Design a protein around this ligand. Sequence first.
Ligand SMILES: Nc1ncnc2c1ncn2[C@@H]1O[C@H](COP(=O)(O)OP(=O)(O)OP(=O)(O)O)[C@@H](O)[C@H]1O
Ligand SMILES: Nc1ncnc2c1ncn2[C@@H]1O[C@H](COP(=O)(O)OP(=O)(O)OP(=O)(O)O)[C@@H](O)[C@H]1O
Ligand SMILES: Nc1ncnc2c1ncn2[C@@H]1O[C@H](COP(=O)(O)OP(=O)(O)OP(=O)(O)O)[C@@H](O)[C@H]1O
Lengths: 578, 136, 136, 136
Amino acid sequence: RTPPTKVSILDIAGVDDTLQRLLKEVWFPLRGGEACEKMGYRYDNGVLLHGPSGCGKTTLAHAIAGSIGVAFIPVSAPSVIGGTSGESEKNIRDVFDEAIRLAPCLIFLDQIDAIAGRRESANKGMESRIVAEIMNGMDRIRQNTPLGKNVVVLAATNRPEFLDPAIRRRFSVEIDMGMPSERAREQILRSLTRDLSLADDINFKELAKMTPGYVGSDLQYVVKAAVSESFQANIDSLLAQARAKHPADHLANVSQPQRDWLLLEAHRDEEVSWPSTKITMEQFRKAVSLVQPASKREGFSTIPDTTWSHVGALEDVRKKLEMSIIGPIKNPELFTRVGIKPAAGILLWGPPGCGKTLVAKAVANESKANFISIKGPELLNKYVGESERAVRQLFSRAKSSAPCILFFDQMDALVPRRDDSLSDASARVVNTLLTELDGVGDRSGIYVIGATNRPDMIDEAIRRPGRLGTSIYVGLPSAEDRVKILKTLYRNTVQGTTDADLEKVALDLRCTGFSGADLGNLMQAAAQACLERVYTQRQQKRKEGEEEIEPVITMEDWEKALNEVKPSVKDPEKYMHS
Amino acid sequence: VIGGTSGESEKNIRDVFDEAIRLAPCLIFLDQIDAIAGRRESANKGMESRIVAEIMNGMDRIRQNTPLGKNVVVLAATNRPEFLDPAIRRRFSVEIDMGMPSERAREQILRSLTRDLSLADDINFKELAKMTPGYV
Amino acid sequence: PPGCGKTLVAKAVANESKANFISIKGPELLNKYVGESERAVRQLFSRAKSSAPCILFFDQMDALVPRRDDSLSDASARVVNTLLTELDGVGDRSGIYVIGATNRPDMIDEAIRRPGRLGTSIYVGLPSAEDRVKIL
Amino acid sequence: VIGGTSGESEKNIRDVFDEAIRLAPCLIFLDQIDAIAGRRESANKGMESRIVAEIMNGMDRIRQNTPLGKNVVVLAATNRPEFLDPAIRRRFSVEIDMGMPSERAREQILRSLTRDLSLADDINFKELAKMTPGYV
Ligand SMILES: Nc1ncnc2c1ncn2[C@@H]1O[C@H](COP(=O)(O)OP(=O)(O)OP(=O)(O)O)[C@@H](O)[C@H]1O
Ligand SMILES: Nc1ncnc2c1ncn2[C@@H]1O[C@H](COP(=O)(O)OP(=O)(O)OP(=O)(O)O)[C@@H](O)[C@H]1O
Ligand SMILES: Nc1ncnc2c1ncn2[C@@H]1O[C@H](COP(=O)(O)OP(=O)(O)OP(=O)(O)O)[C@@H](O)[C@H]1O
């Protein structure tokens, strides 16, 4: 005999719509058994729960059992497997036999991909036999049902693709336990906080709002993180106290962590009373900063220290970018009220080294959003079915977590291989990419940025609206802009700043025919010439006559460097026309 | 037809064909054939390829015995012709396409299901069937 | 031109005839398998044949058709040849009318353009005032 | 002959040859040989090359045993000679070309089949054969 367990039903929240559906399907057959028997109509047999790990699949099942008050038969993935080749099958039979005999009951199959995976992926004669046993059992239930047998088979899996298509057909009802909403997260936070003494400054609503792609397990951890952060005060107190009881002078210290450890080791049997303190909103923010879960293994590239102050000029472009990306992320209220859908993607095109890569990062930084950079051919594999699968995976990861900027550097590699016939592998990848782009427009958060030094050979299909429609040109031909760039570069030095010198340098003819990369090089060249002057002068004086070093840079150094240096890019006609 | 040990499956296929040829007139019905005989290139198992071979051998045996007084017709049902091995496709001669279900057919199916239910007078199964395009 | 209402015109014709309509768009045809692509195309025509009158619509044909004038691969060659074969077959029996649409006409094989296949080349545009007000 | 584990395949080949040499007179028929013994350069698997080796070993064993009273002839059928490994080609001595059925050949085949039927006087098998292009 196996009676039900006592689990809290008030623990799970944020699953309003899904729980309602589950109720409808499970309540009628289990609770009103006499009614269903009289009518003669047939009901729901199998309920499959899917979604990521730690989503509360096992808990939901346990809760449902306890709440209804029916008999719970837990079937875990390795619980039925025996030693001899026959005991496993015998046990499966006994499980189903006892289950049909005693009613009402709930059979729960936790982690089903370990028992019934694809029969083509299993070359063993035992695994295929087990799948067959399950099928046979399912049929037996269906036949017995009109008498008074009431058993519902619940099941939980982490991946639907690994399951055998045959068992998928057998199971009729499916519930997706995915990613929660703002309201849902708020509820989860309250459930966890329930046993804690929160301060008045804590607003769970604010936490929930500023918590984008976090799951039930993640929120659980954020609460735990806060607990550890608060108890740092007690650690400091103990350290001071220990250094007074056992001084040990300066013999116990070589470093800081080691000395702390040693003091505690000496104490051992010393019991201390811990005061119950309340948590602040500041402690939660600190805890949040140190958390990185769920989509941590994705390959999340951290945002650099690049701001708008690092980019000289391009003020028009800055404003346009703010509208498109920062507009929807920071002000969702504004967009919903006016009536327009949020963006999908932009394309940065123009001459090399003009700040395209920088702009992408800068925008990501500003928005305080996530950033992923895939450059040129970082997709392709040696196998026949991995490149396409990988692309699919990227979009799946992006869909799961948002806000994020997906950056594709040098699209000049993948896109031109369409207009002229070359390969089959390249064809499959680009077609999958087009497919993935089309399959996303509603439920944004993921903004795709593309960059290319060559706008020439690219397929018009990719350019079409809904895919990468906003074509932003990054070029450089004006005087005012150059002065701003010079100031921006010479801003990051640390007396003598000299503004007048910067303007004059910009005015010169040689400077007119330059680019961002060229100006950077000029600055470096000037610095090198200055070093030569400092070295020659200092060595002569020290040897003949130790003095001080002068890092100052005058105009003579700039003038000499300017005379020598020549431009990189020659013809702008190629970029503009094509 | 699938068993536990690597040999019982093949033995059963033989027994099925043997009893079938012995007793006549009969109709052998192979329901869902893509699970037994899929493409031999897509099956990396040594048992699956062996089963396809057993079916082929059985087919030949029937052809030889036939002029005596053996009358057996092999019916088969599949959901997808692409998944079937081109070899077995060649063996089978007659093909019938049971396509898109009709208005009349849907009406009949609805009646079969409703049979145990107490329907009201305002319900017109004919109207339901008409406004039900691509449902199976 | 791109986005002139090709889909709308196609539906209007189909609706008026009170006939069936099937729409297969560009890359929503391609699979990972090799020998299944040709069998799938055969299946589409078989389904269309079974339920006639029907209009078979192919949106954005710029993908499949240009891979003839220049030697790319073997897979693309088989698919296009099967398509040409399927088109030639349907003409006397009829009931199934194939409509193709593309925003780009340049690189296309003249063989597909020949009368009896996709021979009737109709040029479409969008320059009307009344329509623009409705869109706004 | 192919099994599940890496060894059962080879064991079976041995058993086939062993039983065959023991019992005489017999005819061993290898149907579709390019699937078992293809070119060893085109097969990057360590199992396929090993199987070709097993066949070669078996062939030698027969030659040695022969002067006692062992009478076994190995027949084989293939669709393409170019796909076969040059090594096995050398082992095999006699070759028969079963070519394309011409107008004359088709006429003969028709007669073979009609043999048990009561044909009318208006039937000219010669006319049928003439107007039957690519039939096997
Ligand atoms: N939605 C949720 N609400 C509240 N608590 C949750 C939720 N999801 C998980 N938890 C906490 O995390 C624990 C793990 O839940 P559970 O084991 O049911 O997840 P799961 O999806 O079944 O994981 P797996 O399928 O990998 O076993 C629970 O004991 C619970 O305390
Ligand atoms: N406006 C700018 N401000 C600061 N640095 C710049 C600017 N433009 C170019 N650079 C310098 O050029 C380098 C490359 O910039 P970025 O990669 O963004 O240019 P790009 O247009 O992507 O061309 P490419 O990557 O092909 O060189 C950076 O390391 C940066 O120091
Ligand atoms: N996704 C859609 N599919 C079909 N019709 C649409 C769609 N969106 C809008 N419409 C209708 O068509 C008109 C807008 O025309 P639109 O510019 O979308 O060209 P279309 O040919 O209809 O769409 P598409 O170019 O995507 O095929 C509107 O009056 C609207 O009622």
